[PDB]
Amino acid sequence: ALTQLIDEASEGDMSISILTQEIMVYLAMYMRTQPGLFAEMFRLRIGLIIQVMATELAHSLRCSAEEATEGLMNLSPSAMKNLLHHILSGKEFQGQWQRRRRLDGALNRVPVGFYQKVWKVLQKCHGLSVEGFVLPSSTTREMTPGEIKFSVHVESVLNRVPQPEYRQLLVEAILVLTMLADIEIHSIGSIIAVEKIVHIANDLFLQEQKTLGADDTMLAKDPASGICTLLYDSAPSGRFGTMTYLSKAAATYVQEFLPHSICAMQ
Amino acid sequence: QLTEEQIAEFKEAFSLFDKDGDGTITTKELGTVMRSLGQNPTEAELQDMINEVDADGNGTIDFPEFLTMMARKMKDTDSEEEIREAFRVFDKDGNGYISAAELRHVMTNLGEKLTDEEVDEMIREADIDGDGQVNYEEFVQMMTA
Amino acid sequence: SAQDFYENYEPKEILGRGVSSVVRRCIHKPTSQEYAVKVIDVTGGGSFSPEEVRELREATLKEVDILRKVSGHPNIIQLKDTYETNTFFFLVFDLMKRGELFDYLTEKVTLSEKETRKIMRALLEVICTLHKLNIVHRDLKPENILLDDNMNIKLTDFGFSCQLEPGERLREVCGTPSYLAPEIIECSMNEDHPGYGKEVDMWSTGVIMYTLLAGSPPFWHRKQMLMLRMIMSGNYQFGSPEWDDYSDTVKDLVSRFLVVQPQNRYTAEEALAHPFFQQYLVEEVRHFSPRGKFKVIALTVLASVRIYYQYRRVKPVTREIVIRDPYALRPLRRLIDAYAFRIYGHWVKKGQQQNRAALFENTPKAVLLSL
Amino acid sequence: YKTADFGIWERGDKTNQGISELNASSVGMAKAALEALDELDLFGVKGGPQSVIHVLADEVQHCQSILNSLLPRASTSKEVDASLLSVVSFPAFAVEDSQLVELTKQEIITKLQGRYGCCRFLRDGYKTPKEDPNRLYYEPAELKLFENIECEWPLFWTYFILDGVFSGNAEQVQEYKEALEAVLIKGKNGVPLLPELYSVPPDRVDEEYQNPHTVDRVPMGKLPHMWGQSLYILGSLMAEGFLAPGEIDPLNRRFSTVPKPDVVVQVSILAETEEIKTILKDKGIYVETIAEVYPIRVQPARILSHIYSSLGCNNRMKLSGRPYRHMGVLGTSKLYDIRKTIFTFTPQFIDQQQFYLALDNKMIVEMLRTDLSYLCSRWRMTGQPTITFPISHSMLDEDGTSLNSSILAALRKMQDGYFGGARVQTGKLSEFLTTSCCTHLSFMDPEVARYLDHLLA
Numbered sequence A: 001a002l003t004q005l006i007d008e009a010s011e012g013d014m015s016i017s018i019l020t021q022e023i024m025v026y027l028a029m030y031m032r033t034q035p036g037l038f039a040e041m042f043r044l045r046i047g048l049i050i051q052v053m054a055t056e057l058a059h060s061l062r063c064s065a066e067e068a069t070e071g072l073m074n075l076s077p078s079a080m081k082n083l084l085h086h087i088l089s090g091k092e093f094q095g096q097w098q099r100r101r102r103l104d105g106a107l108n109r110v111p112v113g114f115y116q117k118v119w120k121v122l123q124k125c126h127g128l129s130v131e132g133f134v135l136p137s138s139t140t141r142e143m144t145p146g147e148i149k150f151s152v153h154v155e156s157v158l159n160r161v162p163q164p165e166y167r168q169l170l171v172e173a174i175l176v177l178t179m180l181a182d183i184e185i186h187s188i189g190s191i192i193a194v195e196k197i198v199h200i201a202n203d204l205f206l207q208e209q210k211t212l213g214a215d216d217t218m219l220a221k222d223p224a225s226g227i228c229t230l231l232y233d234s235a236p237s238g239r240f241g242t243m244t245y246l247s248k249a250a251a252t253y254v255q256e257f258l259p260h261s262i263c264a265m266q
Numbered sequence B: 001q002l003t004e005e006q007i008a009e010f011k012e013a014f015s016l017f018d019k020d021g022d023g024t025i026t027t028k029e030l031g032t033v034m035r036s037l038g039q040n041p042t043e044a045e046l047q048d049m050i051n052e053v054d055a056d057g058n059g060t061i062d063f064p065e066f067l068t069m070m071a072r073k074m075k076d077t078d079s080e081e082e083i084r085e086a087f088r089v090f091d092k093d094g095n096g097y098i099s100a101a102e103l104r105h106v107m108t109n110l111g112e113k114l115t116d117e118e119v120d121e122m123i124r125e126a127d128i129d130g131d132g133q134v135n136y137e138e139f140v141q142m143m144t145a
Numbered sequence C: 001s002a003q004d005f006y007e008n009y010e011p012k013e014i015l016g017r018g019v020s021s022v023v024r025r026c027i028h029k030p031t032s033q034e035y036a037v038k039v040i041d042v043t044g045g046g047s048f049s050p051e052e053v054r055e056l057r058e059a060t061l062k063e064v065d066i067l068r069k070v071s072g073h074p075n076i077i078q079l080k081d082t083y084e085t086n087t088f089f090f091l092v093f094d095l096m097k098r099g100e101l102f103d104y105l106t107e108k109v110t111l112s113e114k115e116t117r118k119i120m121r122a123l124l125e126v127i128c129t130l131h132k133l134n135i136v137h138r139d140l141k142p143e144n145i146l147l148d149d150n151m152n153i154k155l156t157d158f159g160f161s162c163q164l165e166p167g168e169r170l171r172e173v174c175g176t177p178s179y180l181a182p183e184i185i186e187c188s189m190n191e192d193h194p195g196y197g198k199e200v201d202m203w204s205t206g207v208i209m210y211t212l213l214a215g216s217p218p219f220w221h222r223k224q225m226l227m228l229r230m231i232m233s234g235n236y237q238f239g240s241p242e243w244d245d246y247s248d249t250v251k252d253l254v255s256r257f258l259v260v261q262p263q264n265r266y267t268a269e270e271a272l273a274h275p276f277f278q279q280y281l282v283e284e285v286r287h288f289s290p291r292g293k294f295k296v297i298a299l300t301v302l303a304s305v306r307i308y309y310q311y312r313r314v315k316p317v318t319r320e321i322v323i324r325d326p327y328a329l330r331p332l333r334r335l336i337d338a339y340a341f342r343i344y345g346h347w348v349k350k351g352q353q354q355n356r357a358a359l360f361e362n363t364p365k366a367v368l369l370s371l
Numbered sequence D: 001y002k003t004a005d006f007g008i009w010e011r012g013d014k015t016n017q018g019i020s021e022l023n024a025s026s027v028g029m030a031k032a033a034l035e036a037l038d039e040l041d042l043f044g045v046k047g048g049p050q051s052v053i054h055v056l057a058d059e060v061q062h063c064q065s066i067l068n069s070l071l072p073r074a075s076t077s078k079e080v081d082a083s084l085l086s087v088v089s090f091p092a093f094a095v096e097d098s099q100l101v102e103l104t105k106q107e108i109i110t111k112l113q114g115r116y117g118c119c120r121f122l123r124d125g126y127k128t129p130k131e132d133p134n135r136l137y138y139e140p141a142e143l144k145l146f147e148n149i150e151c152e153w154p155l156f157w158t159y160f161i162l163d164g165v166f167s168g169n170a171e172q173v174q175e176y177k178e179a180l181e182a183v184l185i186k187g188k189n190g191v192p193l194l195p196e197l198y199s200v201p202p203d204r205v206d207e208e209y210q211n212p213h214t215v216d217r218v219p220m221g222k223l224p225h226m227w228g229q230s231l232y233i234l235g236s237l238m239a240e241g242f243l244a245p246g247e248i249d250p251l252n253r254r255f256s257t258v259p260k261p262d263v264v265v266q267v268s269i270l271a272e273t274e275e276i277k278t279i280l281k282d283k284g285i286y287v288e289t290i291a292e293v294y295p296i297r298v299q300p301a302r303i304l305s306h307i308y309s310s311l312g313c314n315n316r317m318k319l320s321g322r323p324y325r326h327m328g329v330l331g332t333s334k335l336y337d338i339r340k341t342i343f344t345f346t347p348q349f350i351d352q353q354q355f356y357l358a359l360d361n362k363m364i365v366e367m368l369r370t371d372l373s374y375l376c377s378r379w380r381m382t383g384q385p386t387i388t389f390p391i392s393h394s395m396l397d398e399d400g401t402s403l404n405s406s407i408l409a410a411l412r413k414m415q416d417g418y419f420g421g422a423r424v425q426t427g428k429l430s431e432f433l434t435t436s437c438c439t440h441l442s443f444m445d446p447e448v449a450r451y452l453d454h455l456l457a
């Protein structure tokens, strides 16, 4: 049945069917010998693994996706295993962090305990909405924080954004609520749109660079997401990092929903 | 750049802070001092206060840590306020002149027993303008020195 | 022989990995004591040509030598004994349950002033022993530094070390790029400079100071040669908002190791004599002139007043200051760095394209894209 | 290890919705049963090879790979189950790492035990007064209704008593004996009865919601619980010196937690043709050819899998023997005695007809490196494992006159005595005849037999 499911999920393309099971051996090979590469991935998505492995072998030896598709068939099993380990371990051979966010939100790689941190935040809220799909606080009572079924619910909401790079922006956006939630004594008591916090953070990332001397050329919009391409390439921390602007926009949204706030314990 | 002298001055100050020879200054110990000098802050205040300086240290300040504070991290305004404050701490009278006896008042407060003439001498050694008084200008000139 | 290896130790689990060397935990059967074994593949899977196979042995044969020249010292591992085979070279040393300082620096992005002081107090006292025996490391990276359950520093991988003949200065370029002293590159780009001596380790140690206390290398940028001009010229900045909260005694000692000219560098013996590493010994008479007593009582007051003033100054976290500038104030900036390294702590590794500074954006995009 | 089942509680996952899951109790129990039946004569001492149950350590240690990964959890849906006491200590002894046993036992302690026994698993609600006894299934929302008010079964306290007797913790056999003696319901002529479960009274459900494990519970369910009652008497028998752990465990499963030293993996590199023996000789590799090993004859791992398809065949009972399952090194590293001819089977990762992972020589070393590592740490048979490694023409260079560097490094690596964390004693297959697991395949003793008949001749 497992082989039949792979073949049916192969939608007829025979090259992916073997690559699906070929990677499955390597995933199990690294899982048995190095369990630490999957500590940040609770769902092993082989199907996109070929896709995410395609992009890095596309950017390396810069070529088209179809040439990479022909290229992916061409590597040796050891090279294929190494390149997958190149993907999973976090070793690097658009932009630097744009290639580290298209490789971090396409694998649905999330920090240890992030699914155990959404549970804490949702108890202080009514839900968490992404692209207008809500993950309500009723889930917190329904499954335990450590329940993998809950991990699916948080995960399912987070794939409502198709583009991989924007998902990781949502991922660390969720955590800037978590870290602001600890400081804030009161609860928002309403819905929070995790998507929007990135958007004004995109907007607020826009204003500061305009003031400091950025041209319209460098701050170019991502066609689908609506985020500046430089914001995707921006480093996480720092004065002008992505999570400084998202630690910045995770407060103006709480301004309208929470008229009065008290922040303690620094 | 802090001289062997300066480091030594910071060290004896650390000694004046800890009555026990603990090698550390506790939230309680700082307190005994502030109250010695007349600023009685909440035991909680103290905890925060020792925390601002250390951040781990479990409420005890250490000397390597101590010097870190006494090195002039202070801004001109910031120090100015402080320099001024000590000066007031010095004059309960608030007359604005440093009594030889006022110096004694502070030591007596810090539990160090030192000779009466020596005290006059301490001021005298440092005293030119204020015969018998250290003026604030003398105090500031002195601290930098 | 391999029989001699298994007659005394039994490797249980894999601790770490390397380019061709694997670190493995073992049990010493006679003593039942935890020990680490580094397992270097001499043949390297067949990639090593006979020259590299020979050179790796000579590098390894040398490597036993330095680790045999320094022993019993608290803060460098003890090579308990070394076994060589035709295909491997086993080296058994102390077990460090915790990993390298790089892994630790990933967990805590900014390493606190008290913690770094004893960390490097050992490292400088490590550096004194190497220089007194006249042995330079040239490789003082935090991944070369191992920490135990008590956080004690165990300097590791003297793989690039070489003993200078009295008054001789090397020319070979040995070391990953960021932690190379200015004359390392200068000797690489010129023949007139007759070489570098034991003062090399001082610069590398001073680099750890900027990395540990700020979470970034002093000089880092994504292309290779650009980092080099920041090194030889020596343009470093205790930038804001990051580097303003630390005490001023930190900054001067950082510049001392970071001076570009070697002779003016701050050698290890006087390095421990800078005010930071001064320790409070309880039993000191500390006699003082009457002016000296008056300062102490004034300084004792000046301290108490100071502490109340500094604290009063700290601004509680409010909604507005988060909106205007999160990084500016410490508690929120350290937090942003902390949750920066929890999400992308897998993205920091060894090398140039994986350094920690890649996780920090301290400059406007326009200035970054100026050239 | 690869089959989902409803398990010890006949309800599958925590949701109780007919969803079978991989429970550690089933995986652990099968591992112990497989080890218990391993070379066991079902007729006792007065038995023969016809009455011996043959168990393959590939499936036994595959259950270990799942137990180590699952524990201290019972499944992906259960953070812990008190039935894991039936796996860590008794009667399975299926966990070999003592740290795992203590960690799992203490996890049961914190999350399940109260003052009336231990809960089967978190959010159980089997007989909690907050579930309707008519519906066989539970809706998803009902799971949160069972929190902290779950029925508590003294059955698992008999397991802790049994664990203490086996481990030798007189303190453990005392804390759980007085605890069990205060929950035992007296009946008939004063005999103790073990309640199946202790249930929260319907009015007092809210109190245990707020303050956990303090409200008085009423005995419900089966009275006596014939399962739990037996181990209570069994624990009582072995705690008052009427029975020893060895008599109830004659197969010595209780020693599963004692450390096992790693084994020395014997490797006999072979050459498919004489002309490959010269390339290896030119590189200084002492090998026998495939023909020089005769009378010992080597075969692919598949052939061994076909052979076991005749073990347990009974036409009248319509039993077809073992299904075709892939054979790992633990099966293929034994020496097989089929019809008085010694058989060694090539390890499966070198099989080239199945897939293309054997056609990359850099992958042979990588698979071999882990496969020796799997062998040394997981060998539980008499003798030392013997991997017969035949060098094929595909493992040579594209030129055809030189051995590939990756395999070339691999072969010398084995002669020096260490490869992949395993001690390798390289030699000839004849030398390892007496220091190997010589398993006699008695079912072959008078399809695959017809092939083996010509193969023998």
Ligand SMILES: C/C=C(\C)CC/C=C(\C)CCC=C(C)C
Pocket (backbone or CB within 6 Å): A121, A124, A125, A177, A178, A180, A181, A182, A183, A184, A186, A187, A188, A250, A251, A253, A254, A255, A258, A261, A262, A263, A264, C317, C318, C319, C322
């Ligand atoms: C101290 C925080 C200051 C601006 C940020 C505003 C915080 C919040 C708006 C609500 C988000 C999470 C809540 C968990 C309960």
